[PDB]
Every structure is written in C-alpha cells, then in structure tokens.
Design an enzyme around this catalytic site. Structure first.
Site: not given
Ligand code: CL
Lengths: 145, 145, 145
Positions: A24, A76, A82, A89, A102-104, A113
C-alpha cells in the site's frame, strides 16, 4: 490579499501510509499536506487542510468554507464519494470552484467506486496519479481563478 | 396533558436561508420553527425542534423520542431521506405517528431524490409546498394522534 | 492471550428495549455477558464496542488495526447495506473479520439482502438470534488458531 484554498480529506484518510508498505506504500496525510504547502508557496496561495471521519463534521467544515468565502475547495472524500448525498448537498452550497480528486483510478476498481455523487457540484475530477492528484487539483483551482 | 410533537431537521438544514436570496430565498430554520410554534399554539400542542448534521445524533434523538413517549414526529432529514438506512431503522423503533416532509417537489428533481428509504416506517409524506410543508405536517401529525 | 473485538452497530443500543412481546428482551448488555462467558470457556478475551456514529465506528476499526487485534466480529446494523466508509475501514484490517446478524437478513426486505462488507470479511453468520454472536466468536477463534 492571498487566495485561500481548502483541502478536504475524507473518511479513513488518517490511515494513509500506515498499512503494509510493500502493498500500500508509505504516503501519509502529513506528506500530502507538506507537498500541498510546498506547491502553494510557489503559486502564491494559502492551503488549509482538514481531515475527518464524521460525515457531519465534513459538512460543517464545508458550511464554514461557504461562510468564510473560501476561494476554492479540493476534496478527496474517500468512500463518501460514492454514497454520501449529505456531503453532496453540502458542496452544492459552495459558489467557489470545487475540485474532486482521488489517488487511484477509481473508474478501474470495484464498480461502486466508478460513480461519484459529487459530479454535478464540482468543476471536474482528477484520479489515478497518486500524490500528484493532490497537486494537480491545487493547480486546477489556481488556474480557475 | 398537552401533546408533544418533535420536529427533526436533517443534514445541511442549518444553512437554510443563508444562500443567495435571489436564487434560494431567505427562509431560515429559525423562521420555520417560529411558524411551527405559532401553529402548535393555535392547535393546542407543543412543538420541539431539533437539527443536526450527525447521523448518529439524529438516530439518538429518535431513541430519546421513543423513550420520552413523544406523541408524533415530523422529519425532513434532507439528503439522508435517500440513503440513510440507519435513520430508517431508528424511525422504525417509534410507535407514534411519523410524518415525512419536504419543501420541494423531490419527485420532480434528480432521480436519487425520488425515493425515500423512510416510506415503510412513516404514516405518509408531504412535499412541494415550501414553508407550508412544515405547517401541513404538524396538522397531519396532530390529526393522527 | 488472544483478543477478539465485538463491534455493535447503529441503533443497537436499543436492543431489548422495545415491546417484549413483539421484539423480545435481549439486550446488548445480555449479549456482551454471553460473549464474555464463552470467551473464558474458549480461553480468549472479548472487548465490545457500540456506537451510532459512522466515524466513531471507523476509528474503532483503526484502533483495532493499531492494537493488532486477533479477530473482529461486526454486526454493523443497517450500515451493513450502505456504509462504504466502514467497508473501507474494515479493509485496513489484516485479521479475520466475521460479519453476523441475529435475523435472516437474506429473507427480509431486499435492501438487507446485500452486504457491502462481503469482500472484506472471512464469512457471514445470520439468522440464529443470540447464537449468532456466540457462533461468530467460535468462528473467529478457529480462524486465528
Ligand atoms: Cl509549475
């Protein structure tokens, strides 16, 4: 005199870089905020970072950004992206540019996602570039001004 | 001896009336609660109002309404209406009449607002009448008791 | 000694406090007592945690990661069916995670048929009431040893 950009880190992001380093990586929220601060100084803007695991705390920080006339917001939101219509709102109240990042590459991960509930209340979205996603989002907001 | 009704304001509703007056109007949560208090006095009941941005605080307020034998509950949970199964299962604990309400015609907005996850645990729904939605809901709750 | 963490989800503080004829009297306190009794029989320690705040649940999971818990049992309540935040918190864990429910969720309302935790847990136990907790503890201990 200086433009103020707000960085909103979402749920579980305090655990960035604290998992297995081989699988990771080791990028932490602290390193991300330092890199944002490094780029902010060259761009002539201020960056304030905020992280929370509470949906209400996130919305209330967004309310504060509306009242404090924040110049741009980067978010982020993590998994909240999601499903959290409440944060959606909350972001809708903002009149400054909002940048989702997003990093990914979320569009190439699990189906849930692939969809962001923020799509209609942000200027655009950036995903897949790891740490650089944050810097590109800051760049996008500054170029918007 | 007087019947007690609980009004539950949902996420982001503390920002009612604090946006652009030309586009969003000036109706505030404070003005809504005053008009509710006026109608309650005219109807011979008590109305208590509660707003939160925390899903847990909302569920816990509902638990308190169950233990305190509240006579009827009005809820406009905001965006929570469309995904918070936690608030849904909290409302299910109640045995008093529950009235869901919205200022706007949610069935004519974005598709995700067309569905309420509360439908099976409320007596009914009122939507589209702006400020009057709150007043109609209070009337409906008093007649249900 | 091996440590197992029991995570009780949203609305579960109201277990056993509804109509006894329709909902029974099993309380979270009674469940925790039975878990401690079985833990002593199995030769492990059990710690229980309940919250109605999604953020508090995720942070307890973060703590479970840092304390190198041997196994986690979770009955997240209605969160099971939508909280991607809790799902991504559970994904940080490397110990076995056991999802459990008192009721047969697959035979209730359609929205309870799906768990967003399925890809981050070892398995699921549902339908056996109080026994679901005790069976889950047994499952977790066998997963560790
Ligand atoms: Cl440059």
């Amino acid at each position: 005199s200086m433009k103020k950009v707000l960085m909103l880190h979402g749920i579980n992001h305090n655990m960035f870089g604290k998992r297995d380093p081989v699988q990771y990586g080791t990028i932490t929220l602290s390193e991300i905020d330092n890199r944002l601060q490094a780029l902010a100084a060259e761009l002539g803007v201020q960056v304030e970072s905020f992280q929370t695991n509470s949906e209400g705390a996130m919305c209330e920080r967004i309310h504060q950004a509306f009242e404090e006339r924040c110049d741009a917001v980067l978010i982020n939101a993590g998994a909240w992206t999601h499903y959290s219509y409440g944060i959606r709102d909350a972001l809708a109240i903002l009149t400054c540019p909002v940048v989702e990042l997003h990093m990914s590459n979320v569009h190439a991960r699990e189906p849930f996602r692939h969809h962001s509930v923020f799509s209609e209340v942000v200027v655009g979205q950036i995903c897949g570039f790891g740490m650089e996603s944050y810097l590109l989002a800051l760049r996008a907001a500054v170029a918007q001004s």
